[PDB]
Design a protein around this ligand. Structure first.
Ligand SMILES: C[n+]1cn([C@@H]2O[C@H](COP(=O)(O)OP(=O)(O)OP(=O)(O)OC[C@H]3O[C@@H](n4cnc5c(N)ncnc54)[C@H](O)[C@@H]3O)[C@@H](O)[C@H]2O)c2nc(N)[nH]c(=O)c21
Ligand SMILES: C[n+]1cn([C@@H]2O[C@H](COP(=O)(O)OP(=O)(O)OP(=O)(O)O)[C@@H](O)[C@H]2O)c2nc(N)[nH]c(=O)c21
Ligand SMILES: N#Cc1cn([C@@H]2O[C@H](CO)[C@@H](O)[C@H]2O)c2ncnc(N)c12
Ligand SMILES: [Zn+2]
Ligand SMILES: [Zn+2]
Lengths: 116, 300
């Protein structure tokens, strides 16, 4: 039996169909002079970012579903996630769709300059 | 002036009065602060609480242990915990808890009545934001409330390290006389009102550096009356000003010494170190917690 709920795809499809993004992600007060790295132990938003409590931005945490990992570990819980201000209306969608550069810790496409 | 502070602490002279309890009547009751864009009240409030705690002699050891009661929200997240974890040194052990299920950034979360929460470890900081919604059903004289306040008082007396501190939320009608009495078992104490919630009778009763014995005898019914008298005669203007400067927000890692000591060894020099935020007394074993689970079979 290969059956598995695909919550990521479900939310991506829901958004594409015009659904309102998940809300009540926990935005933090911060200096907005941080490193701008994607996922950090303390808020690190730069001037172009908002910092959020990580658990509240995790689709799996918020939906009470298993994390897609054999360990079931969460890369957001207990940390802070930096979200481009232009995408801060849907932090859960942003974290789901985007990827962190393993080299510089910036979001690929939203601060990673490794490929330039 | 007060509007640029994170909040207002009850002045010492009001603590020294002998007031009778009156109804609380705030001139700005019902007014709401203007918060920064997209910032929740719960984040602003806890940010201001922590900004004020930064001005006190808190003990901040390595592998500090913090427990946070009443941490869930009707949204199913834990904004307060997120602020505490931001404030506290990275690596601080943070446990939170609430009657209702929620998802949290804490290292461990227990769901259930606080009375179901157990641990044999002692804690360096206890935060409580618990409030019984039925407190709103005011049908009689405003007497000392029990419920979770009974738990919190026992938790402080049994599981708070010497040198540790507390911040326990109260309101006009959500208060407990024994909790005020226990404020006199700390080197210092106050009732702190956040400027973002200045239109509420809420305050955080803060006990700074626990001594394990009364330094001062406090009558809790009188002290609550004194608190309401202060609030009734000192309007606080709503302010969010302090939220905009977070450059000094992080709690400084003092690396406070942790020692285990027998009750006979707590001399006046030890008590002095405790009173200055320079010492924590407790075991430093692994931290273990649990939630009591009631078993029953409802079939037939
Ligand atoms: C101080 N006060 C109390 N009352 C009356 O007494 C009752 C109980 O008074 P209280 O102890 O609840 O105090 P207060 O109203 O100041 O509390 P507030 O609603 O601001 O709540 C404070 C915090 O408690 C928590 N809280 C309140 N309600 C809930 C809830 N339903 N669920 C979870 N948390 C809650 C929230 O964190 C909130 O910020 C009030 O519901 C009101 O009829 C007042 N009436 C006037 N006209 N002027 C006042 O100044 C006044
Ligand atoms: C903020 N604060 C005030 N006090 C006591 O209240 C005195 C004046 O209070 P103040 O510092 O508010 O002026 C201080 O000298 C202290 O004895 C304090 N005492 C301890 N141990 N820790 C504190 O943070 C503290
Ligand atoms: N009475 C009572 C309690 C209230 N709360 C919580 O205070 C939080 C206030 O925002 C809320 O989320 C609530 O669920 C309690 N949590 C544990 N044990 C309790 N006995 C209580
Ligand atoms: Zn998660
Ligand atoms: Zn990169």
């Amino acid at each position: 039996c290969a059956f598995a709920v695909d919550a990521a795809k479900a939310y991506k499809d829901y958004l594409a169909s015009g659904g309102q993004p998940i809300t009540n992600c926990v935005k933090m007060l911060c200096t907005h002079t941080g490193t701008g790295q994607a996922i950090t132990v303390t808020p690190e938003a730069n001037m172009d970012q908002e910092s959020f409590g990580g658990a509240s931005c995790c689709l799996y945490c918020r939906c009470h579903i298993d994390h897609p990992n054999p360990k079931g570990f969460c890369d957001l819980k207990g940390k802070y996630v930096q979200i481009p201000t232009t995408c801060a209306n849907d932090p859960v969608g942003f974290t789901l769709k985007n990827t962190v550069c393993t080299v510089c810790g910036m979001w690929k496409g939203y601060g990673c300059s490794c490929d330039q | 002036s007060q509007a640029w502070q994170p909040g207002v602490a009850m002045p010492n002279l009001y603590k020294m009065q002998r007031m009778l309890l009156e109804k609380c009547d705030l001139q700005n009751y019902g007014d709401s602060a203007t918060l920064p864009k997209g910032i929740m009240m719960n984040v602003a409030k806890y940010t201001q609480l922590c900004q004020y705690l930064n001005t006190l002699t808190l003990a901040v050891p390595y592998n500090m242990r913090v427990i946070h009661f009443g941490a869930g929200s009707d949204k199913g997240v834990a904004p307060g915990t997120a602020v505490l974890r931001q404030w506290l040194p990275t690596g601080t052990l943070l446990v939170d808890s609430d009657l209702n299920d929620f998802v949290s950034d804490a290292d461990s979360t227990l769901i259930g009545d606080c009375a179901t929460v157990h641990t044999a470890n002692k804690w360096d900081l206890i935060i409580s934001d618990m409030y019984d919604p039925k407190t709103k059903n005011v049908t009689k004289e405003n007497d000392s409330k029990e419920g979770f306040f009974t738990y919190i008082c026992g938790f402080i007396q049994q599981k708070l390290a010497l040198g540790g501190s507390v911040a326990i939320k109260i309101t006009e009608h959500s208060w407990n006389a024994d909790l005020y009495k226990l404020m006199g078992h700390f080197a210092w104490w106050t009732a702190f009102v956040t400027n973002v919630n200045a239109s509420s009778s809420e305050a955080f009763l803060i006990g700074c550096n626990y001594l394990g014995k009364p330094r001062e005898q406090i009558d809790g019914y009188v002290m609550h009356a004194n608190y309401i008298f202060w609030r009734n005669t000192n309007p606080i203007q709503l302010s969010s000003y302090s939220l905009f400067d977070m450059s000094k927000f992080p709690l400084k890692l003092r690396g406070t010494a942790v020692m285990s000591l027998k009750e006979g060894q707590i001399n006046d020099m030890i008590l002095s170190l405790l009173s200055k935020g320079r010492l924590i007394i407790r075991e430093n074993n692994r931290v273990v917690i649990s939630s009591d689970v009631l078993v029953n079979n409802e079939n037939l």
